[PDB]
Amino acid sequence: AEPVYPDQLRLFPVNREEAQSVKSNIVGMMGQWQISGLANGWVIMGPGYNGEIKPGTASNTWCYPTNPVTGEIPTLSALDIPDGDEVDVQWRLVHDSANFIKPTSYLAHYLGYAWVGGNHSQYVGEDMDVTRDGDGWVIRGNNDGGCDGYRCGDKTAIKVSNFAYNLDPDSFKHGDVTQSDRQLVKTVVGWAVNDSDTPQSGYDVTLRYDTATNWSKTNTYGLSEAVTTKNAFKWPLVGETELSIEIAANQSWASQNGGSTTTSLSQSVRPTVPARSKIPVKIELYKADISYPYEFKADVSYDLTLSGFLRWGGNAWYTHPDNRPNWNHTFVIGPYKDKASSIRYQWDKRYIPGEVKWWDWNWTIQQNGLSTMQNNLARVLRPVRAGITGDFSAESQFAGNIEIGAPVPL
Amino acid sequence: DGYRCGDKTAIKVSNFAYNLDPDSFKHGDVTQSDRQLVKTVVGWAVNDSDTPQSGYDVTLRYDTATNWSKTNTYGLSEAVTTKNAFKWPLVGETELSIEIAANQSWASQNGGSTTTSLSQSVRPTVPARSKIPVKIELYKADISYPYEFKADVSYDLTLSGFLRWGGNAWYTHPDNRPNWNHTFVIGPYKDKASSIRYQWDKRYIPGEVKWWDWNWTIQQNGLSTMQNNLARVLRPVRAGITGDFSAESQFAGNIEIGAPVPL
């Protein structure tokens, strides 16, 4: 009837359906050949009995506490970054030890990654090096000197990339738009003549320009069969001659695929002309490179990737491998995009065994405690806000011009 | 007197661009020459009702296009033949041959196109119990007109030469005196490799130093010297411009609404 979170269970109320809904977690938390009651004559049996639930009696009963608590991840206040360009904000973000470096290192440590730290300290998240690599950043423990341990030279690597911005609607501005390397496409001029006694607005001149590309591929197969007969006869005047007859047949099959993409652009002018007058018009089209600056305020999200090998003594992956494999996983720190990359979705769905496909958070709660994981995940998912300035540029764009001239009396 | 003193460094200026003041642009008379007719149309709009009517339309459109494509094909073929000889009644000795064959083929294609179009319409309003004539014409002609404006001037700056053996500012610091070319854009931002300001501002990030090492220049000459030199280099320029426009084989049109005639 009600969802049961395994971290709230207590062997002092528990329905048979509730016990069956969360079965593997309850079986794993009891000793082998242990028998404890549930409710209304039902009891649950431990390992060695294959977790069978059968009618019985017992004085030791599982019991969900009268008033359990909600285990949601808390929401913290936003972190403010000093204003600058996109790269300055990223640099300021990835160099904060107390707000960024420690929580992510602790998250990697809690999930079972190995050697999250440098050689000059004994604690997680200490002696970490930050480097700029391509469009992202890499954070890894310092590897200078020596270390003592099995594969202590294989430090876990944390990578940050794909930064996105959620703008405030009323903050965006942009400056002057400038053009360079202009090339003419086509122009048109014309006149609109009105010789009636009333104003007229039924005029139209339109210029359009299109470009396109296409591709295709084809495969063909076939067969052929032929029979030939040859003989020789003597015919009058022709004398000896050779006569040959051939009959053939063939079959063929073909298959094709393709595609295309078209780009278009048009300009129109529709002037209103006074009575007994005329008006000139002109339309131009160009190709040019465009540039302009901008500024805004937004919220910053990014992708978080953890790379390393999982500890032999225990890790949080749902299959619990024990051969120290190399692992990669990506989280999206921000709005929901997918189930495999959402921490909140996996955390909220930990009461359904069939939804546990990537990480086992109940194992982490057992290992470290509920409040520790809650605070760590709250610090990890803290919102970030900053002011941004930047520059836009693009090559081979379109530029147009439409003009309506002054009227000339007739 | 010097090692390769005859190889002087060359400075080149090109690609001038203008940022106009919005309220300064003007142009003069537009003139046409070498006019060639395309197509014309005339017509009448008749209104025999008791109210004014505006539901009329005449439209003329002209289109041109080009296209291209390329194709590659490959294939294989296998055949087996058997030949024998037999004696058959009346036919006597004869030769019988049987052949069986198979083939395969693969193909790939690419292409593209570009279309140019232009149209003219007239939609007159006709009074009750009257008629109105219309006419539309299309021409090809060469166009010319003068103009003037005020703008800001930007350009591309290119340096060509070889780098000194005793030390240079390139981030790999070569020492074999190679020939070098590099282009700066003196004006609005277009790219990272050609922006002095972006490279100067990002000198505190070692991973962003990919073209020039400005910290080396600051060590060699001092902060204020480089600041003043770069400030003088990037000074804005303004001027007034007059010019002439011309183009060949453009479009020229004409649309007319005539006077009403009572019915």
Residue numbers in the entry:
A (entry chain B): 1 to 12, 25 to 422
B (entry chain A): 160 to 422
Which passages does the manuscript contain on this structure?
Aerolysin is a β-pore-forming toxin produced by most Aeromonas bacteria, which has attracted large attention in the field of nanopore sensing due to its narrow and charged pore lumen. Pore-forming toxins (PFTs) are important virulence factors of many pathogenic bacteria, which are secreted in a soluble form and upon host membrane binding, they oligomerize into transmembrane pores undergoing a complex structural reorganization. Domains 3 and 4 form the 120 Å long 14-stranded β-barrel, with each protomer contributing two antiparallel β-strands.
In addition, we also solve some key mutants that are regularly used in nanopore experiments, namely, K238A and K238A/K244A. For analyzing the lowest constriction ring, we determined the structure of the K238A/K244A mutant in SMALP obtaining a resolution of 2.2 Å. As expected, the two lysine to alanine mutations also increase the diameter of the lowest two constriction rings without affecting the upper constriction rings.
